[PDB]
Design an enzyme around this catalytic site. Sequence first.
Site, short mmCIF file in Angstrom:
data_model
loop_
_atom_site.label_atom_id
_atom_site.label_comp_id
_atom_site.label_asym_id
_atom_site.label_seq_id
_atom_site.Cartn_x
_atom_site.Cartn_y
_atom_site.Cartn_z
N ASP A 17 78.99 30.34 60.75
CA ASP A 17 78.84 29.08 61.30
C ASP A 17 79.81 28.92 62.41
O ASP A 17 80.80 29.47 62.00
CB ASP A 17 78.72 27.86 60.22
N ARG A 27 67.15 24.82 73.68
CA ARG A 27 68.20 24.91 74.89
C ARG A 27 67.70 25.04 76.23
O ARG A 27 68.34 25.40 77.07
CB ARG A 27 69.19 26.12 74.41
N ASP A 33 70.25 29.21 70.12
CA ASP A 33 69.66 28.21 69.24
C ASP A 33 68.45 27.86 69.63
O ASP A 33 68.13 26.66 70.12
CB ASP A 33 70.53 27.02 68.51
N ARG A 88 64.23 20.61 61.27
CA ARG A 88 64.68 21.96 61.45
C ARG A 88 63.86 22.90 60.09
O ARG A 88 64.12 23.79 60.57
CB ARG A 88 66.06 21.94 61.40
N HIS A 137 85.78 15.11 46.10
CA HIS A 137 86.96 16.01 45.91
C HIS A 137 86.99 17.14 46.57
O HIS A 137 87.69 18.22 46.29
CB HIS A 137 86.77 16.26 44.47
N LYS A 168 69.23 31.43 58.32
CA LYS A 168 70.25 30.52 58.21
C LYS A 168 69.85 29.31 57.56
O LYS A 168 68.80 28.80 57.57
CB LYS A 168 70.86 30.08 59.70
N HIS A 169 70.74 28.60 56.65
CA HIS A 169 72.15 28.79 56.72
C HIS A 169 72.53 29.28 55.31
O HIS A 169 72.42 28.42 54.36
CB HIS A 169 72.96 27.76 56.99
C1 LIG Z 1 74.55 23.70 59.89
C2 LIG Z 1 74.16 24.18 61.62
O1 LIG Z 1 73.78 23.31 62.35
N1 LIG Z 1 75.21 25.05 61.87
C3 LIG Z 1 74.99 25.42 63.34
C4 LIG Z 1 74.14 26.64 63.56
O2 LIG Z 1 72.57 26.26 63.07
C5 LIG Z 1 74.16 27.20 64.83
O3 LIG Z 1 73.20 28.45 65.09
C6 LIG Z 1 75.45 27.65 65.38
C7 LIG Z 1 75.57 28.09 66.77
O4 LIG Z 1 75.19 26.98 67.61
O5 LIG Z 1 76.21 26.45 65.27
C8 LIG Z 1 76.41 25.80 63.96
O6 LIG Z 1 77.18 26.56 63.05
#
Ligand SMILES: CC(=O)N[C@@H]1[C@@H](O)[C@H](O)[C@@H](CO)O[C@@H]1O
Length: 342
Positions: free
Chosen positions: A246, A70, A62, A132, A175, A162-163
């Site tokens: 995800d 990272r 990411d 983001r 709900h 994404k996403h």
């Molecule tokens: C909504 C959100 O932040 N989902 C994250 C995604 O962005 C990320 O690429 C994945 C791997 O780290 O982890 C999560 O699924």
Amino acid sequence: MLPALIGISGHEVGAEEEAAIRRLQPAGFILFSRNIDSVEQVRGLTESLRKLCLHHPVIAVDQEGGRVVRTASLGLNLPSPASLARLGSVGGIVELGAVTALALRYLGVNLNFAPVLDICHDPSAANALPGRCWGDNAQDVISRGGVYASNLRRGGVQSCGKHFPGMGRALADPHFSLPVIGLDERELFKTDLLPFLALCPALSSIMSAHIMLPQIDPDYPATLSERVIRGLLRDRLGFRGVVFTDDLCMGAITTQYSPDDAAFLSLKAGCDLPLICHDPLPWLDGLASRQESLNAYDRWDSFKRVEKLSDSLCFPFPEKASLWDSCLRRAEALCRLEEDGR
Ligand SMILES: CC(=O)N[C@@H]1[C@@H](O)[C@H](O)[C@@H](CO)O[C@@H]1O
Ligand SMILES: [Cl-]
Ligand SMILES: [Cl-]
Ligand SMILES: [Cl-]
Ligand SMILES: [Cl-]
Ligand SMILES: [Mg+2]
Ligand SMILES: [Mg+2]
């Protein structure tokens, strides 16, 4: 080949990890800051992952910029997409894609979980991870995200939109356990789904989110809904590439399914590579066992998509210190560009 991406605990493949990789042959791996300490150490880790795999493995990260980066331990920092959108610099967006591609390729990374194509509809919608999003409407997200994805891919690193189906519209609902998008499909295709449709040629892959689309499926979230993946994503949107999920190991999704069942369900629904990011080993055997319970033709279609992705993956650059110094130099200059433009 086990159809999933799995995480790695540390700076080298551990004994238990290496054992499971030899035995199960996972399609690929996702790295996090815990795996990234020095250039030499990272290039050694990704070399190990490639050697342990008979196929060319996906090695993903990411590397979005801003608060999702990272590579801090390398000194490589990048501005957020939102800050480059505010800066308005077209060259700055190109450079984010180009520098990200260059650096990830030097580390032996071959896929980046970016661009984020979520729309930030209102400056009121609170986001725990700010910055983001490339814009506050579909057309700006398409324009800025498209320039990014193009230059990421021009540098040899695969992209991931994404996403899906568009997290900017997802609201908490009393709900429902997971977030909910109550919009009609027709309005989705005019808005939150439009970046995915418009940028298909620039998206190596798409990642589906754990979101409820109750007008399409009231019982399963998008990642686990055959109607959402095979209907909305494959048929109406027309996406033919690899579909990731995800993360299955953290979040509200874990209060509904364990990672091994959710991974199976996402493959049943038509995803290709569920993400088992954190502590993957307890779940891999149950997944690999339930695999032959899937429709053999669906498995063949999904394997051909993964195989096409694998064949597009690029290999790390040859060792060359001056190349990495340029990555650091351009990343630093990109951060100062945004800082000076505020
Ligand atoms: C909504 C959100 O932040 N989902 C994250 C995604 O962005 C990320 O690429 C994945 C791997 O780290 O982890 C999560 O699924
Ligand atoms: Cl281990
Ligand atoms: Cl920001
Ligand atoms: Cl819009
Ligand atoms: Cl496509
Ligand atoms: Mg270091
Ligand atoms: Mg290999």
